[PDB]
Amino acid sequence: MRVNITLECTSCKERNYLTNKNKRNNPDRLEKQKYCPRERKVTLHRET
Amino acid sequence: KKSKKMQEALKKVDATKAYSVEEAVALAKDTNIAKFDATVEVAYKLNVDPKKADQQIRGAVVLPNGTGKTQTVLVFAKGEKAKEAEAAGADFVGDDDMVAKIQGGWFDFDVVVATPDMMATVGKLGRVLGPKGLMPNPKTGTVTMDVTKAVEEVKAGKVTYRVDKAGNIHVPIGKVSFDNEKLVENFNTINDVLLKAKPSTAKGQYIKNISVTTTFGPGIHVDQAS
Amino acid sequence: MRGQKMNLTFGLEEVYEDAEFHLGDFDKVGIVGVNGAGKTTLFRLLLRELKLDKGKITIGNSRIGYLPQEIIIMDEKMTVLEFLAEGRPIKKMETELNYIYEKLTVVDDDKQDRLLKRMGWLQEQLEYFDCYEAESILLDLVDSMQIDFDLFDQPISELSGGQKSKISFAKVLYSKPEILLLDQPTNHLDSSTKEFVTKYLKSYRGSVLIISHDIDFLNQIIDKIMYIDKVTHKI
RNA sequence: UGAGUGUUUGUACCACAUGUACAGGAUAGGUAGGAGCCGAUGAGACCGGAACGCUAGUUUCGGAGGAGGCGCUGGUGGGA
Numbered sequence: 001m002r003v004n005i006t007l008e009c010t011s012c013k014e015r016n017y018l019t020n021k022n023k024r025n026n027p028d029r030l031e032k033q034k035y036c037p038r039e040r041k042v043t044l045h046r047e048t
Numbered sequence: 049k050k051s052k053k054m055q056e057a058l059k060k061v062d063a064t065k066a067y068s069v070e071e072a073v074a075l076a077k078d079t080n081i082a083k084f085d086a087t088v089e090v091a092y093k094l095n096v097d098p099k100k101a102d103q104q105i106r107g108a109v110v111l112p113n114g115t116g117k118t119q120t121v122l123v124f125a126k127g128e129k130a131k132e133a134e135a136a137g138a139d140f141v142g143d144d145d146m147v148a149k150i151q152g153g154w155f156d157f158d159v160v161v162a163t164p165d166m167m168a169t170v171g172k173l174g175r176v177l178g179p180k181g182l183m184p185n186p187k188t189g190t191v192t193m194d195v196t197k198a199v200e201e202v203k204a205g206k207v208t209y210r211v212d213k214a215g216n217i218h219v220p221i222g223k224v225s226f227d228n229e230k231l232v233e234n235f236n237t238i239n240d241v242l243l244k245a246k247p248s249t250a251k252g253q254y255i256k257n258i259s260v261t262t263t264f265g266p267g268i269h270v271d272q273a274s
Numbered sequence: 275m276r277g278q279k280m281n282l283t284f285g286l287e288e289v290y291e292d293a294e295f296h297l298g299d300f301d302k303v304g305i306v307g308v309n310g311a312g313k314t315t316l317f318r319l320l321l322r323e324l325k326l327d328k329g330k331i332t333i334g335n336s337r338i339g340y341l342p343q344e345i346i347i348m349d350e351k352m353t354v355l356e357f358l359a360e361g362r363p364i365k366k367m368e369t370e371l372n373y374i375y376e377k378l379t380v381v382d383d384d385k386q387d388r389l390l391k392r393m394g395w396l397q398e399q400l401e402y403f404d405c406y407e408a409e410s411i412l413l414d415l416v417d418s419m420q421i422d423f424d425l426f427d428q429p430i431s432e433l434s435g436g437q438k439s440k441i442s443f444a445k446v447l448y449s450k451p452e453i454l455l456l457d458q459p460t461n462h463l464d465s466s467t468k469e470f471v472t473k474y475l476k477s478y479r480g481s482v483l484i485i486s487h488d489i490d491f492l493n494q495i496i497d498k499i500m501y502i503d504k505v506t507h508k509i
Numbered sequence: 510u511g512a513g514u515g516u517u518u519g520u521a522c523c524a525c526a527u528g529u530a531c532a533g534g535a536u537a538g539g540u541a542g543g544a545g546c547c548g549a550u551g552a553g554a555c556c557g558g559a560a561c562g563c564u565a566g567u568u569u570c571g572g573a574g575g576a577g578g579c580g581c582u583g584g585u586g587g588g589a
C-alpha cells in the first residue's frame with residue numbers, strides 16, 4: 001500500500017515536504033536529511 | 049456523657065448561629081471553665097485536598113501579640129551565623145558535632161533553624177527530626193540565611209501551620225490570658241495569611257467552615273465575612 | 275478515563291480505528307480480548323507511554339498503580355527487597371535531596387531560591403509518602419501472600435514464576451495507588467494465591483482495570499467488561 | 510396541572526456507632542491544644558445483658574455499692 005505522507009522538520013516542527021511511501025516496504029516512519037527553508041539548513045525530517 | 053461545665057458552655061454556644069470574630073473570642077473566654085491558662089485555637093476547613101501536590105500548604109506566620117507561651121529556640125549555625133544567633137539570644141547554638149548530642153539532649157526545644165550550609169550536615173540528623181516535625185523547612189522559612197530574624201520571630205511567637213490530611217488546618221491564636229481583643233487580632237492575622245496561602249489550582253469557596261475553640265471549650269463557628 | 279476517535283497503527287497492522295470508550299469512576303473493569311487485540315497497548319496509552327496517532331485519550335489526575343504483564347528486572351543482581359522498595363519514590367527523592375544539600379554548601383547566593391524550592395517540595399513530598407513505610411512493607415509481605423523473608427534477600431531473577439508474580443503484585447499494592455491497572459495479575463499464581471488476590475480485589479474500593487484470560491477470576495470481581503475487538507479495531 | 514399513600518433510589522445536614530498491621534502496658538484514625546481532666550449532677554472495683562470483634566479484647570445497657578479514677582510523668586513506637 002503506497003500512500004502520500006508529510007516530512008516534518010524535527011528542529012522546527014515545520015511540515016516542509018510532501019512525498020509518498022509504501023507502508024508495507026517501509027513500515028517505520030521515513031526519515032531524511034532535507035533542507036529546511038525556515039532554518040535555511042539541512043535538518044532531519046521525519047514522517048508524521 | 050458530658051461534664052456539667054461543658055454542658056453549661058454548650059448552652060452558651062449557638063450551634064445554629066455562626067458568631068462574629070469578636071463575639072467568638074469573648075465567648076471562648078467564657079467557655080473555658082477549667083482554671084488553667086488554656087490556649088485558643090482556630091480550625092479552617094479548606095476546600096483544597098492535600099493529596100494533590102500543589103494543593104498542600106505549609107507555612108509559618110508571626111503573631112504581633114504572640115501565642116501567649118514563650119518558645120525555646122534551637123539553632124544550627126557556623127561562624128558568622130553562630131555570632132548572629134548569639135546576638136539574637138537564641139536558647140541554643142550548635143554545630144554539626146553538637147547535633148549528635150542534641151539527639152537525646154537539649155530536647156523539648158520548640159523549633160529548629162539551620163543555615164543552608166548546615167542543612168547538609170543537619171539532614172542526617174533531620175531524618176530523625178522528620179517524624180518529629182522539628183526539622184526546618186524552607187517554605188516555613190525556618191531555613192534562613194540569617195538566624196536573627198527566625199529567633200526574633202520565634203520569640204515573637206511565630207506559629208507554623210501545616211494543613212492536616214483531612215483538610216482542616218488548626219492553629220493557636222493566643223492564650224485565654226490575652227484579652228479577647230488581642231485574640232481576635234491574632235485570628236485576623238491568621239485569616240489573612242490563609243487567604244494569601246490559597247493555591248491557584250484551588251476552586252470554589254476557600255474555607256468550608258471556620259471554628260474557634262479553647263482547649264477546654266467547644267468549637268464555635270465564626271462567620272467568614274466577620 | 276475517556277478516549278475519543280482513538281487511532282493507532284504500528285507500521286501496516288492497525289490496533290485502534292476510531293475507537294472510543296468511557297469508563298466511570300469506581301468501576302472494576304474487566305478488559306478482554308484475544309492475544310494481540312491491544313489490551314496491553316491500552317494501558318500504555320493510559321500511562322502515556324504511547325501516543326495515539328489521532329484522537330484524544332483522557333485520564334484522571336489520580337495516581338495509577340500499574341502491574342506489567344512482564345516482570346521488569348533492570349539488573350540480574352537486584353534483590354527482592356530492592357525491587358519492592360523501588361515501588362515508592364522514597365529512595366529516588368532522597369538521592370536528589372542529598373544532592374540539593376551538596377549544592378547548598380557550594381552555592382552561596384546564586385541558586386539558593388531554586389534549591390530551597392526543590393528542597394521544600396522533596397520534604398513535603400517525602401512526608402506525603404511517609405518515610406515510616408520501611409516497617410509497613412516488611413509486614414505487607416506477611417499479610418499479603420505469606421511471602422517468606424528468606425526470599426526478601428534473594429535475587430529477584432532467581433525467584434520462580436509464581437513467586438515473581440507475588441512480588442510484582444505486592445509492589446503495585448506497596449505503591450499505594452489510586453487506580454489499579456492489573457495486567458494478568460494471576461498469570462503464574464497457584465490456586466491458593468489466586469484466592470487472596472480475588473478477595474483483595476473484591477474489597478478494593480477504588481477503580482481497577484484488569485486484563486485477564488481467566489473468566490472465573492474476572493466473574494468474581496468484574497462489574498463492567500471492556501472487549502477489545504481484533505477485527506474491527508474498536509472498543 | 511393540584512393534592513396524598515407507599516416503594517426504590519440520589520443529595521445534604523443531624524445523630525449515632527467503628528478504627529486491633531510490627532513493636533508497643535494494648536483495639537494507636539489524623540491534626541491542634543492539652544496538665545491538668547473527670548466522678549455524691551453517683552467514681553473506682555464487682556456482677557448480668559447486648560453489640561462489635563482481627564478473638565486479643567472494645568463499646569454500650571443494667572444489679573448492687575458508694576468515692577474515686579484517668580492523664581502528665583515513665584518505656585514502646587513513625588506516630589502515646
Ligand SMILES: Nc1ncnc2c1ncn2[C@@H]1O[C@H](COP(=O)(O)OP(=O)(O)OP(=O)(O)O)[C@@H](O)[C@H]1O
Pocket residue numbers: 284285289307308309310311312313314315316343
Ligand atoms: N512497536 C510495535 N511495533 C509493531 N507492532 C506492535 C508494536 N507494539 C505492539 N504491536 C502490536 O500491537 C498488537 C497489540 O498490542 P498488545 O501487545 O497490547 O496486545 P495484547 O492483547 O496485550 O496481547 P496479550 O493479551 O496476549 O498479552 C501486538 O500484536 C503487537 O504485535
Ligand SMILES: [Mg+2]
Pocket residue numbers: 310313314315343
Ligand atoms: Mg498483552
Ligand SMILES: [Zn+2]
Pocket residue numbers: 009010011012013014036037038039043
Ligand atoms: Zn526546520
